[PDB]
């Protein structure tokens, strides 16, 4: 494999009721007029050409859930052929337009247990001024 493929409804309802064992599947949605969808699609296409051991599915939003609300943004659904353990809901957990492959492979952590020392610094936060100062003062005095 190692490449995405367009899926329909019959194949989806068959893979849902298949219930395998150690088969990894990652499904994604698609929306028009949003560059984030194209960006994440390009990122997934670039990532799939390096780790040929996990199935990727690029579904369209008009084929699943016909009565979708306004807050139904395209997300990522990682399944274990009938198991639910990760539901990445909301793009606020990433960063927006500043997305890369390292953040994707760190947020995944389920399709290829390799760990390239990314758990030490996955994203650089914003160091506080008063909290860091009082912490340094406490550590130095004691």
């Amino acid at each position: 494999f190692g490449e995405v493929l367009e899926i329909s409804g019959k194949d989806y309802v068959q893979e849902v009721t298949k219930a395998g064992e150690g088969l990894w599947v990652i499904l994604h949605l698609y929306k028009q007029g949003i560059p984030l969808c194209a960006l994440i699609n390009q990122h997934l296409s670039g990532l799939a050409r390096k780790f040929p051991d996990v199935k990727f599915i690029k579904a369209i939003s008009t084929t699943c859930i016909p009565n979708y609300p306004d807050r139904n943004l395209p997300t990522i659904f990682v399944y274990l052929e009938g198991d639910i353990k990760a539901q990445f809901i909301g793009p606020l957990v990433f960063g927006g337009m500043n997305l890369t492959r390292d953040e994707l492979e760190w947020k995944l952590s389920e399709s290829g247990a390799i760990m390239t020392d990314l758990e030490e610094n996955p994203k650089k936060p914003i160091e506080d001024v008063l909290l860091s100062s009082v912490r340094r003062s406490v550590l130095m005095k004691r």
Partner: protein, 521 residues
């Protein structure tokens, strides 16, 4: 219906023609394009903008298709055709609204184009060289951007003209081909910019780290080798099935004893120095220096390709693999005349004197900025393009916007002398021809109303009083808003390109005007 869809198509064609309007000529602003993703591309080319642009109108689609078809066969002239078609459409819209059959204006446009082509075909230049390529003082300064140096430009122009007029080429057996284009360059730093020399025969790469050759005698012919002998594997040619641990230590001596006969046959007749790339050992050179055969290191693929394409001595005809026990022929032997390593620019490079077929000149730059490599290169490219385009075809026209006024005057005179139903069409076609000088004057931050008027007043005198046809053809200038004669220092342009562009524009206008309705019938 009927006229509404035609007006909509005309408006769409006029709106799509106003995007590449502010980008004609060398002086123009940049344009930014977004792919609706996040990346932006900044470009100011008349073809890149039209190639990377979304379209949704059938007329615009067929116009872009015709423009691409014209650009696939013609080099330049893919931007003014759209403006010409838009002007023709906006001028024929009023004629159609004035209750005129489109067939009449179509026939009038066809007759006007035929008359313009007939008048253009009778105004050409027979001579191809005037006192050494336009006195070799004017044909090089206009084709070279001088922003940091211009006091000693005469020497540079003389060097350029001497490099482009002395060396020629002929291979089609019908017309002289263009001379050398990919000449050798040498970027130097910290040298005398007020002095330059010209030598014959291009040099190869600088030998660094292996200059232990006591060159004291004058050679004659050389050779070449693509592969390189080695005890262990490194390149292509070494077998992987033969497993011999006690033979890799003596394979070099066996290869030397095998190639001894080839080295002796090379040393016979007249050949000494061989060309070997990196990957050879130092013991072979020390063993062969006692007989007179050596090898010059630092050989790349570009130098090998240049040697194979220059003198013609190919190696693939005989050698192909590491098996050096092939036949001995004159195909893999570099037949030269003299190979000496003189002392130039405090270096020792391979100097081949009296090279067969082609004879290139070593252009060595001086100590200045790194942008000098792109200063004379564009001028040399323009010069070779000119001498290769105007050679086999003597249909050239001087200036850039000095012919449209005379063409419009002739078309108006023909329309006045005709007096038939197709009278206003020729007048409209003549009026729709002053859109290039006006745009050139607007883009140059000058007054176009006065410039076009002065150009027309100067061109009317050449037609009212028949005195000559070569002179009195002044045009526009780029430095300032003053009329300059585009003959003693102007740049000629191929007339076939303009003829094809005008024909394509007329065909596109006729095709657009012939379209009635677009309703799903």
């Amino acid at each position: 219906t009927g006229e509404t869809i035609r007006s909509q198509n005309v408006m769409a064609a006029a709106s799509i023609a106003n995007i590449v309007k502010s980008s004609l000529g060398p002086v123009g602003l940049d344009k930014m394009l977004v792919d609706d993703i996040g990346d932006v591309t900044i470009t100011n080319d008349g073809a890149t903008i039209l190639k990377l642009l979304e379209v949704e109108h059938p007329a615009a689609k067929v116009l872009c298709e015709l423009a691409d078809l014209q650009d696939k066969e013609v080099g330049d002239g893919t931007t003014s055709v759209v403006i010409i078609a838009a002007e023709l459409l906006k001028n024929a819209d009023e004629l159609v609204k004035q209750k005129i059959h489109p067939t009449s204006v179509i026939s009038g446009y066809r007759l006007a184009c035929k008359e313009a082509v007939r008048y253009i075909n009778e105004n050409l230049i027979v001579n191809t060289d005037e006192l050494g390529r336009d006195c070799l003082i004017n044909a090089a300064k206009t084709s070279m951007s001088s922003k940091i140096i211009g006091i000693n430009g005469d020497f540079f122009a003389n060097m350029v003209v001497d490099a482009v007029l002395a060396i020629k080429y002929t291979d089609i057996r019908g017309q002289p081909r263009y001379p050398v284009n990919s000449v050798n360059i040498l970027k130097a730093h910290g040298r005398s910019q007020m002095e330059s020399m010209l030598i014959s025969g291009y040099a190869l790469n600088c030998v660094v780290g292996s200059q232990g050759m006591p060159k004291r005698i004058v050679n004659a012919k050389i050779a070449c080798l693509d592969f390189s002998l080695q005890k262990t594997k490194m390149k292509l040619g070494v077998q992987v099935v033969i497993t011999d641990p006690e033979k890799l230590d003596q394979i070099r001596q066996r290869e030397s004893d095998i190639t001894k006969e080839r080295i002796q046959k090379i040393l016979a007749t007249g050949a000494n120095v061989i060309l070997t790339t990196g990957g050879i050992d130092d013991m072979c050179l020390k063993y062969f220096v006692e007989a007179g055969a050596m090898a010059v290191r630092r050989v790349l693929k570009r130098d090998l390709k240049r040697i194979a394409k220059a003198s013609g001595a190919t190696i693939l005809s005989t050698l192909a693999n590491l098996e050096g026990e092939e036949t001995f022929e004159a195909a893999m032997l570099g037949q030269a005349e003299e190979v000496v390593q003189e002392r130039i620019c405090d270096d020792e490079l391979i100097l081949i004197k009296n090279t067969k077929a082609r004879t290139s000149a070593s252009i060595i730059l001086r100590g200045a900025n790194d942008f000098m490599c792109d200063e004379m290169e564009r001028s040399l490219h323009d010069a070779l393009c000119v001498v290769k385009r105007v050679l086999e075809s003597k249909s050239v026209v001087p200036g850039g916007g000095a012919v449209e006024a005379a063409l419009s005057i002739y078309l108006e005179n023909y329309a006045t002398s005709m007096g038939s139903r197709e009278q206003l069409a020729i007048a409209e076609f003549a009026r729709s021809l002053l859109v290039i000088p006006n745009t050139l004057a607007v883009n140059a931050a000058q007054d176009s109303t006065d410039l076009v008027a002065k150009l027309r007043a100067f061109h009317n005198e050449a037609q009212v009083n028949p005195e000559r046809k070569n002179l009195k053809w002044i045009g526009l200038d780029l430095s300032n808003g003053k009329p300059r004669d585009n003959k003693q220092a102007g740049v000629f342009e191929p007339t076939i390109v303009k003829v094809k562009s005008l024909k394509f524009a007329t065909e596109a206008a006729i095709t657009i005007l012939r379209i009635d309705d677009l309703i799903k019938l």
